[PDB]
Amino acid sequence: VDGNYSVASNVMVPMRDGVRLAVDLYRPDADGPVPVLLVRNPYDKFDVFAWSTQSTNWLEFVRDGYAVVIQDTRGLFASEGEFVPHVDDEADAEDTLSWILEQAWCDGNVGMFGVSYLGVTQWQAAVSGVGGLKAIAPSMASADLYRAPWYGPGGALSVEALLGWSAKIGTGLITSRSDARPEDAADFVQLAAILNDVAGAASVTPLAEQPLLGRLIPWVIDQVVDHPDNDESWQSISLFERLGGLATPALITAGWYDGFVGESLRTFVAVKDNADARLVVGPWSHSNLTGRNADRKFGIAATYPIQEATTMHKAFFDRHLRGETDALAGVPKVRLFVMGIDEWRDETDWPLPDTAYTPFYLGGSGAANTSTGGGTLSTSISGTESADTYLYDPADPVPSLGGTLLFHNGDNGPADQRPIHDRDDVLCYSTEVLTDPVEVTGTVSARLFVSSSAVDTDFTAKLVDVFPDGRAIALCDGIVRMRYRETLVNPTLIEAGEIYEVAIDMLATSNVFLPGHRIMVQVSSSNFPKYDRNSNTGGVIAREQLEEMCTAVNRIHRGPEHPSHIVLPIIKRK
Amino acid sequence: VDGNYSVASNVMVPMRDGVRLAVDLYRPDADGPVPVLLVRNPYDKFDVFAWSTQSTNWLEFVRDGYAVVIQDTRGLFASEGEFVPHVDDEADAEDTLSWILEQAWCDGNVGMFGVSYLGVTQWQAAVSGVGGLKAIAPSMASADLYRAPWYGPGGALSVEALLGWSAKIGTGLITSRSDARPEDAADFVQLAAILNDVAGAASVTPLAEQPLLGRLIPWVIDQVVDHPDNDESWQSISLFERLGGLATPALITAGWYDGFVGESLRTFVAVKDNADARLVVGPWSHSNLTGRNADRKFGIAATYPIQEATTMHKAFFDRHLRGETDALAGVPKVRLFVMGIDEWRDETDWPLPDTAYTPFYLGGSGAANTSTGGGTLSTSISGTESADTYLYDPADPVPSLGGTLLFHNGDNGPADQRPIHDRDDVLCYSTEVLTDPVEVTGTVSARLFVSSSAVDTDFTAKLVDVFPDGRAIALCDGIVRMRYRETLVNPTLIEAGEIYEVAIDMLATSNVFLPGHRIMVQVSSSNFPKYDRNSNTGGVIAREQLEEMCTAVNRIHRGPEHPSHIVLPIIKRK
Ligand SMILES: *C1(O)O[C@H](CS)[C@@H](CS)O1
Ligand SMILES: *C1(O)O[C@H](CS)[C@@H](CS)O1
Numbered sequence A, B: 001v002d003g004n005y006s007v008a009s010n011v012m013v014p015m016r017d018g019v020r021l022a023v024d025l026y027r028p029d030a031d032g033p034v035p036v037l038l039v040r041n042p043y044d045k046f047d048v049f050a051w052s053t054q055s056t057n058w059l060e061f062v063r064d065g066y067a068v069v070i071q072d073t074r075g076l077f078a079s080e081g082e083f084v085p086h087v088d089d090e091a092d093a094e095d096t097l098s099w100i101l102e103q104a105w106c107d108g109n110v111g112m113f114g115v116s117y118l119g120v121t122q123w124q125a126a127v128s129g130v131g132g133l134k135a136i137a138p139s140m141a142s143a144d145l146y147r148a149p150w151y152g153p154g155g156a157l158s159v160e161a162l163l164g165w166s167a168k169i170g171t172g173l174i175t176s177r178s179d180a181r182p183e184d185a186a187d188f189v190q191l192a193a194i195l196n197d198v199a200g201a202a203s204v205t206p207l208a209e210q211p212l213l214g215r216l217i218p219w220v221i222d223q224v225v226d227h228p229d230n231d232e233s234w235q236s237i238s239l240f241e242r243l244g245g246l247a248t249p250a251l252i253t254a255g256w257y258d259g260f261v262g263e264s265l266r267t268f269v270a271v272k273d274n275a276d277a278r279l280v281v282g283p284w285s286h287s288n289l290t291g292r293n294a295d296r297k298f299g300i301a302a303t304y305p306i307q308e309a310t311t312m313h314k315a316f317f318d319r320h321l322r323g324e325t326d327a328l329a330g331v332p333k334v335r336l337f338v339m340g341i342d343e344w345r346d347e348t349d350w351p352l353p354d355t356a357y358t359p360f361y362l363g364g365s366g367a368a369n370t371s372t373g374g375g376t377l378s379t380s381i382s383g384t385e386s387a388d389t390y391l392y393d394p395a396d397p398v399p400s401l402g403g404t405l406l407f408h409n410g411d412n413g414p415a416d417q418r419p420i421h422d423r424d425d426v427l428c429y430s431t432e433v434l435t436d437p438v439e440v441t442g443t444v445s446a447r448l449f450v451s452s453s454a455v456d457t458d459f460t461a462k463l464v465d466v467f468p469d470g471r472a473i474a475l476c477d478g479i480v481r482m483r484y485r486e487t488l489v490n491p492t493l494i495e496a497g498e499i500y501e502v503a504i505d506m507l508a509t510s511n512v513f514l515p516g517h518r519i520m521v522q523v524s525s526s527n528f529p530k531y532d533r534n535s536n537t538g539g540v541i542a543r544e545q546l547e548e549m550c551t552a553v554n555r556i557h558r559g560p561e562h563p564s565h566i567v568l569p570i571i572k573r574k
């Protein structure tokens, strides 16, 4: 019967090592084999409502004749084995895909879909070389776990993401263990305390001493905290360099305020030349898909469009798993939610063709410290040789407000920055009030000429849309940890007092700065707990006590010989 | 096979009039008949992810051997007939329950669960007299549609709820019609415009002229706007007076910032003496179950506890549908999220036994206008005979901020009231800063001595928790429309200048006002668009042009002969 299906729970699938993973099979009433979609989930395959609202109304797929397999990853819930993030997912996906392809009900065409960890696992599956995998659809995901979500392109630890997620999984690890333990109740209370106060959890020094999380999930220290360089342990689990050799269609979703945004977009660029890639980017953060934030509303159109997403996924799978050549007729290659105008818009590529990468130079009379300073932005090089100076004290870092926060207040991406504008270590540079709109859509970066009293420190840059009423709304930001200025792999310290030209990767955005607005840039040396705080010592940061850390006198140089600037991806549409 | 199930889509169930309703059947792999749960849904039975996250992980029920039936209500999606809210749901539920009980796979025990409209329909089912219905679980619902969500106990129209919901259904009505229409695209745009700007939509005068909504859903005017009195049209669809004669177990869920809170709680009180009633109340609004708000966070424990809810529902249904006498061992009768302390707490009853209904009298030297006025609250009667006076202008009503908003900014219940504190028509009365905690848990009301220059007007009262940092956080509020001061059914006008003692029903709350806080009350004559604005004419409000309306000079009298006060449900726990 068309539209009818059955569900078989806890079908045990043997991996190459004999460890069995549990899957649930959603199989249509059909007369022969069918195309199959696989989802790999560390958050209980039974708990479909937890993630599905951030994805697709995928029961539509089943009603339309696809089978769907949802799997508990190794060591969690109904699966056997031991759980360690990332390290088993390439092999376990390969073995699972192989098992699916062998089944009576599989017609030889398999795809995947899902969000976050259910997205990362799709890249890990895609590098398997399993020919039967015809398409993937990774949403809010990464193919390089160092670059997102654990560290970043600037070489700072994404500490709130790490501690929040580890506490989240810690709840899952206890819930899914064999027998209940006397310490479980107290552990459950302590994990809740972390999730209620992620900045507090991240504030403990040495950062690497995590009695609870290190016990429940040793990986938090053994892999993440202990490996600050993008070293061999990270390279092992990275998929990114293998993406170029694939020819697997990928339907990629991202969010402008999502922790994974930079890495999600990079995956699109990596696969677009060799297969049918599609891109959808909305104004969402990882846990807020509503389009509504405390000081910024994007409109109901911005709410994660789950039925349109479902329709697009089905068309995509119809094309690539069912060989329906015209299934994607009228579907755009790229669909972006352009903020400011607050409208969806179709594009032919990402980056946009006809992106003008335009320097906006830091300038101004007098100090740029605070929002009431004299800092300017201009497409013209600054005429006078100046410098702005501030003290960065690790005991008092600049608090994270919006941006791509994941677990610490991660539901307010476009956050008003005014609460930090009176700080002396927040340097502000803005354009005059705009008389005509300026669209900035693409990857964003800064090139700063900097010096420090320290042998290591951080520099941050944050793009901001200043509204007529004074709201200073965050758009996108990045960090550079100075030891990693030239490489994430082989860091070196800097010489105190020497001027360096450094790049800050500020991920990406799409925003029209409307008439009456200003373009604003904030520069500092911290953004905590989005990123951990530099100790300004050159030491092993995560092993240092707060008292061991040093203050740094940091300086931004600006003028004709040191033309510090932000590079804006300008789009002009007449 | 235990834990396995099948799904049959679009099974057509004939009603008494021959009109067939579409249902989906989720039926366990079992050897005989099973207990059955029914959900009646106007938002597409296929779209389970849309509502389920506000309810239960109900696939657990199916894995555990319950069948679940989800039905499209009459005239929507796959169902035949014509849709009109409420009017067909008693009969259609009776006929559906009867059909279920006749099926080979039903063991004679049926229950229901679900939220909002999926909750209201359970009360409509419960009055059917169908013996096979053994238990219901209505969440965020009402048994009196006048009192919630369309009007209220004060006799003002809940205009934002009406217009927002009508636009929401209007999307559904177009989506589920026979053939696509040329006007659909433009209609879809206009509906989005309403949902993006509900206060704007509610601001049009006459309010009753609704070209779009009146065309798509004539009921919006024909029933709701046209019937401001709690008349026979409303009585017809009310279930409340029939609740006392039932003996049906009900698991009732409510939220402190939910539009239905007053009516949800009243249903518990109505059924508790005759059957096993249970109550769960969290700090949620209708569309925000997260525990997180712009200026108030309740902690992760406050996040809608969906797996605990699932466990409780299963225990409840095990007791009442499966006759498992000990299934509810250790389950509390009442479980409340007590704000301030921000903790869940078990109780034996609602209202709490040992509630001290305590008057807090309005007082103070000089005018109470604005937060910087002299208004006080005290358990002692005020010594001097005073009055506070203000102009209420319908062209400039007090904006709604938080509270029990549904569609207009309905995601910020505990909203900071400071943005309206400089208004001359907002009278503020507060206690001194508290040195010891004061718990207020229960139903809340005000008794005010009032006068007006007009023959009709409104008075509002809003309970507020003032935090050390100045945040003035809304707790619960109500309104009285003066023509309905003595009855919602047979209104009469007032005499200009005469003093009336009126009651304002302020719904309910649970809050510990902690040391360093103040208890605050705001009094005014508007709260728009939570409630429509009184025209101050005595006329048919929804038919008046703004220009036809009048300003009113309104007065609150306070002192020994006019002891205006709020009645707080004080709980003392030592
Ligand atoms: C997704 O499920 O949420 C996490 C946010 S850090 C991420 C871990 S790879 O996956
Ligand atoms: C629920 O589904 O949302 C509506 C809010 S007004 C309500 C109508 S009875 O049901």
Ligand SMILES: [Cl-]
Residues within 6 Å of the ligand: none
């Ligand atoms: Cl089988």
Ligand SMILES: [Cl-]
Residues within 6 Å of the ligand: A019, A074, A080, A081, A082, A083
């Ligand atoms: Cl293992």
Ligand SMILES: [Cl-]
Residues within 6 Å of the ligand: none
């Ligand atoms: Cl262990």
Ligand SMILES: [Cl-]
Residues within 6 Å of the ligand: A295, A296, A297, A298
């Ligand atoms: Cl806005």
Ligand SMILES: [Cl-]
Residues within 6 Å of the ligand: A301, A342, A343, A344
């Ligand atoms: Cl749009």
Ligand SMILES: [Cl-]
Residues within 6 Å of the ligand: A352, A353, A354, A355
């Ligand atoms: Cl372009």
Ligand SMILES: [Cl-]
Residues within 6 Å of the ligand: none
């Ligand atoms: Cl100097």
Ligand SMILES: [Cl-]
Residues within 6 Å of the ligand: A499
């Ligand atoms: Cl130089």
Ligand SMILES: [Cl-]
Residues within 6 Å of the ligand: none
């Ligand atoms: Cl059958």
Ligand SMILES: [Cl-]
Residues within 6 Å of the ligand: B019, B074, B080, B081, B082, B083
């Ligand atoms: Cl009909």
Ligand SMILES: [Cl-]
Residues within 6 Å of the ligand: none
């Ligand atoms: Cl029609």
Ligand SMILES: [Cl-]
Residues within 6 Å of the ligand: B295, B296, B297, B298
């Ligand atoms: Cl708070």
Ligand SMILES: [Cl-]
Residues within 6 Å of the ligand: B301, B342, B343, B344
């Ligand atoms: Cl609690």
Ligand SMILES: [Cl-]
Residues within 6 Å of the ligand: B352, B353, B354, B355
């Ligand atoms: Cl009590």
Ligand SMILES: [Cl-]
Residues within 6 Å of the ligand: none
């Ligand atoms: Cl007078």
Ligand SMILES: [Cl-]
Residues within 6 Å of the ligand: B499
């Ligand atoms: Cl009198």
